[PDB]
A paper describes a structure:
[name] is an essential transporter in Mtb and categorized as a member of the QacA (quaternary ammonium compound A) transporter family. Mtb [name] is a 55.58 kDa protein with 14 transmembrane domains (TM). [name] TM helices organize in a typical MFS transporter fold where two bundles formed by 6 helices (TM1‐TM6 and TM9‐TM14) are arranged with an internal twofold pseudo symmetry.
We determined the structures of the antiparallel dimer EfpAEM to 2.7 Å resolution and the parallel dimer to 3.2 Å resolution. The parallel dimer uses the same interstitial residues that interdigitate between identical residues in the sequence in a side-by-side manner, resulting in a twofold symmetric assembly in which the symmetry axis is perpendicular to the membrane plane. In both the parallel and antiparallel dimers resolved by cryo-EM, the density of the two fatty acids chains of PG1 are similar and lie within the protein domain of EfpAEM. PG2 densities differed between the parallel and antiparallel dimers. In contrast, in the parallel dimer, the two fatty acid chains of two individual PG2 molecules of the antiparallel dimer are replaced by a single phospholipid molecule. One acyl chain is inserted in through the sides of each monomer leaving the head group in between monomers. While the parallel dimer we see could perhaps facilitate the association there. that the antiparallel dimer is a non-physiological arrangement.
Numbering used by the authors:
A (entry chain B), B (entry chain A): 49 to 518
Write the structure that this text describes.
């Protein structure tokens, strides 16, 4: 039981954080009808979590080296679980935003430690390959369970949806206490000066990006915050040259395979994030399956993805990460080509929608394990901290960049085919049909980004005896 | 002057075959007004040329070994030039059909000899690379010059357009005679039984594939035509086992890098053929440029292609055919993504149409040179005949296969967007707008087929020392 209890506990924060993201999105309209927070406050509950989760990520990367990775994992999760209760008792806009702020602080501390715990706890070999599959398995499980939970326990109250994290979170705190052993190495000094500038630079950059669309791109306060971030970013690099125990080891990023792998995960995250957002919007708006029925209909995705991850964990020892990334990428290509020809409003569920989801899930799951193992290959125990923190930063940061281009193509083609921009419930059956054909057309431009991802994967060059097979 | 006159004469049949093909398509509607051979006779003049050109392709490969490579190239061109004069004096469908039949026979003899002449005449190294670029360069020149000649000298008569091949064709016979030296090796016995079975199989398959859409797929004679095609093909393989100097050396095609490099050009030719048909139809119908203006507007394509071919000849000695094929093909991906977003009816010619054509021309030209050098590498002199005939047979055969799939996607999406199937001259500006967006949508599926070509190009693995640099 020691093995299964360890992989479940380590990947728990991936289950918790991803599930919370979808439930908060689903319950947003009912928050309007109760708190009466207006349209300006609608975005302030979402970006409040993102403000601290991305701002504190680098600080939480080096936090486990000076205190302890296991202690960091329990503390970070506990603050996440406590914050959910404070989120479900919110009475005023100030109460909710502060509750969402502290969830990001709790997530930023524990999330990078989860990836680092895979490399240190499990030795290189079949154990790490099985641990990588489980770590990637429950990220998609939380997303699907988020739709089912958020689509079922929402008509009685949005407050009960946030209270489902507590039973799940308490188990992972219990499992991590009795299934993970505290390692014994001497603690190292924290880069306090480096962490101060790194935190205030990423938080300012996210604040400027969020306030842009609201107050205008050239309001005067947005540029002022960007100037502060650019001044901090310049100073942060300067100190790191002669700073012991760097937050970011720039010397570790050379012309080696590390840049190619870290550039691939930056773009591969954007392809996956944009694919999830567009498919969920297409099913809920064009097909009208709502939250509950869409989540149950995505159950085959988890089973197919679980099949792909389990198979890829066996083949990684024999095949290089280059061929498994491409091999699973071609199964993705056939899914969205078949998912473009056979999608309009009113099609049956089994002949038309089941196959693209199942086949695409196997291809996606096949290429996740080789990419994860190569990003934590040949780094060591003193430097696995910041490397894991950077890997989760680039994976999440690439999402909005790619989706911004994809959503621009969707909007442009809607106008050309004949349509309007606005809420969907106010669109007759010619502007609605144009939006149907716009999303399907934009599914092919997602494949255009996937080709770019695969082209960068040609330069990995890792052999199977380095990433695995030890 | 010896070098430039030699290579021009070698690639001369490529100029003739492509340019005559385009002119025959352009002047087809005027043949209706004069010969009055009805709809059923419209497709016979196109079918008649293809029936013998593809039917006698395999015979022409081994015909140069038993007779002479230079002598075969002269008679093949001479019969082509002669048949153009008889074509332009046609006075009934029977006279025009016979002339088109004889034009294919002359082309089937000289076309495979042109590619074989590249390998034997020029020694492997810098001389072959420069000769390869000019060989591919004049294939694209003939296509554009066919539009201008057939779009300008056709308002006076369709008979004058057919007589423009004689001044050019007579020059090619002169340059070949003066600038090509007759090699001195002993002639070999021709496989009489194999040549008879090879000829009958291809014409029967072409005849069945042509009468199918006309008379019905299960009409009764198409299955009979398919019966002799299978009977000839089955006996051809049986008798080829013990046949001296085989027509098709099956033993040469093993699990080595030759089957991969022959499957790539099978589908690369289909992508390039479907790109020309779709673009030419889109420009003439949606934009209404007619034939003369379309030919002038595609002049920058040839200039851009010439730059791509010239650069690729220098780089092929330092880079393998794998990287140049994948690297050159990414420029094609960028052009067709740009050409899908910024191309509708009524756009200016400069910013929206010239840029994708110029960039796409460079990308195509960079990938053509490595593919043909790999297709004639390391075979010898006693087997360069059949191998070059197969390379031209598969390149032409892949065209209709890929285009049939693309045209099915275009027709399916036209109906969904709102529109009908029929002549463009009866549209109510609403079905015309839908046909505009259907062609643009189908441009991305051509990119999907080009991705498959890239995938097979990863298995080439030819060293630049083997295909060049000697
Ligand atoms: C090593 C460093 C880091 C490693 C750490 C990383 C470790 C592993 C991570 C891997 C990737 C992400 C995990 C997966 C998360 C989400 C996936 C999921 O399970 O979530 C369900 C849904 C989301 O939706 P959701 O966002 O909730 O929607 C709500 C709206 O926003 C408003 O309510 O996604 C999907 O089903 C995905 C479907 C793609 C399959 C391919 C189909 C192609 C053809 C389909 C045609 C249909 C027509 C579409 C026409 C466009
Ligand atoms: C070694 C083995 C063998 C080696 C032996 C062979 C050695 C090398 C041979 C390679 C392949 C063929 C060469 C090229 C031949 C044709 C190309 C050409 O020069 O011909 C011009 C025109 C043809 O037209 P044509 O067919 O005459 O038209 C008539 C109508 O059918 C009815 O009159 O094509 C083009 O301009 C091609 C443009 C492609 C550039 C990239 C475009 C991307 C953006 C597109 C946006 C536009 C919107 C499209 C929306 C869909
Ligand atoms: C932390 C992890 C996160 C998990 C996040 C979860 C997401 C993970 C997803 C991973 C999928 C990526 C794989 C991408 C597969 C694509 C394959 C590829 O990358 O392959 C490139 C292709 C080969 O290249 C091309 O584009 C081909 C261009 C055209 C080819 C050349 C044609 C030009 C000549 C024309 C005619 C010449 C005449 C011939 C006459 C002979
Ligand atoms: C095969 C097993 C099972 C099959 C089983 C078959 C059944 C179905 C299919 C299964 C999966 C397919 C396998 C995909 C394999 C691909 C990986 C690969 O085999 O790769 C080849 C080559 C080797 O490399 P090399 O190390 O020399 O050789 C060592 C090896 O031969 C062994 O040791 O990779 C390259 O170099 C790539 C060359 C292209 C140059 C890049 C330029 C274009 C991109 C520009 C910028 C990027 C994008 C930016 C913005 C767009």
């Amino acid at each position: 039981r020691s093995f299964i209890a360890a992989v479940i506990a380590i990947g728990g924060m991936q289950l918790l954080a991803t599930m919370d993201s979808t439930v908060a999105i689903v319950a947003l309209p009912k928050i309007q009808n109760e708190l009466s927070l207006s349209d300006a406050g609608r975005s302030w509950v979402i970006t409040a979590y993102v403000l601290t989760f991305g701002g504190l990520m680098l600080l939480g990367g080096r936090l486990g080296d000076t205190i302890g990775r296991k202690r960091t994992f329990i503390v970070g999760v506990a603050l996440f679980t406590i914050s959910s209760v404070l989120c479900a008792v919110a009475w005023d806009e100030a109460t909710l935003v502060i509750a969402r702020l502290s969830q990001g602080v709790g997530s930023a501390i524990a999330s990078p430690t989860g990836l680092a715990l895979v490399a240190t706890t499990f030795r290189k070999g079949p154990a790490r390959n099985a641990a990588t599959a489980v770590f990637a398995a429950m990220t998609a499980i939380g997303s699907v369970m988020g739709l089912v939970v958020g689509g079922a326990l929402t008509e009685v109250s949005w407050r009960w949806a946030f209270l489902v994290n507590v039973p799940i979170g308490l188990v992972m705190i219990y499992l991590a206490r009795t299934a993970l052993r505290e390692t014994n190495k001497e603690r190292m000094k924290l880069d306090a000066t480096g962490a101060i500038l790194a935190t205030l630079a990423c938080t300012a950059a996210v604040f400027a990006f969020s306030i842009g669309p609201e107050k205008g791109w050239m309001s005067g306060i947005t540029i002022g915050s960007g100037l502060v971030a650019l001044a901090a970013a310049v100073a942060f690099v300067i100190v790191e040259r002669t700073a012991e125990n760097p937050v970011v080891p720039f010397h570790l990023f050379r012309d080696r395979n590390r840049l190619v792998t870290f550039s691939a995960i930056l773009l591969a995250g954007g392809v996956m994030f944009s694919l999830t957002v567009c498919i969920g919007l297409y099913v809920q708006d064009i097909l009208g399956y709502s939250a509950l029925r869409a989540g149950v209909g995505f159950i085959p995705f988890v089973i197919a993805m679980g099949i792909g991850l389990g198979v890829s964990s066996q083949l990684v020892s024999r095949f290089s990460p280059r061929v498994l990334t491409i091999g699973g990428g071609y199964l993705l290509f056939g899914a969205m080509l078949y998912g473009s020809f056979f999608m309009h409003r009113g099609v049956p569920y089994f002949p038309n929608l089941v196959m693209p989801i199942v086949v695409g899930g196997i291809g996606i799951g096949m290429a996740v394990v080789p990419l994860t193992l190569s990003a934590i290959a040949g780094v060591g125990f003193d430097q696995i901290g910041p490397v894991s923190a950077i890997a989760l930063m680039l994976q999440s940061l690439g999402g909005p960049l790619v989706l911004a281009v994809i959503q621009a193509v969707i909007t442009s083609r809607t106008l050309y085919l004949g349509g309007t921009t606005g809420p969907v419930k106010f669109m007759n059956d010619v502007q609605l049909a144009a939006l149907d054909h716009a999303y399907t057309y934009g599914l092919l431009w997602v494949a255009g980004a996937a080709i770019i991802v695969g082209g960068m994967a040609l330069f990995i060059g890792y052999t199977p005896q380095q990433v695995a097979h030890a």
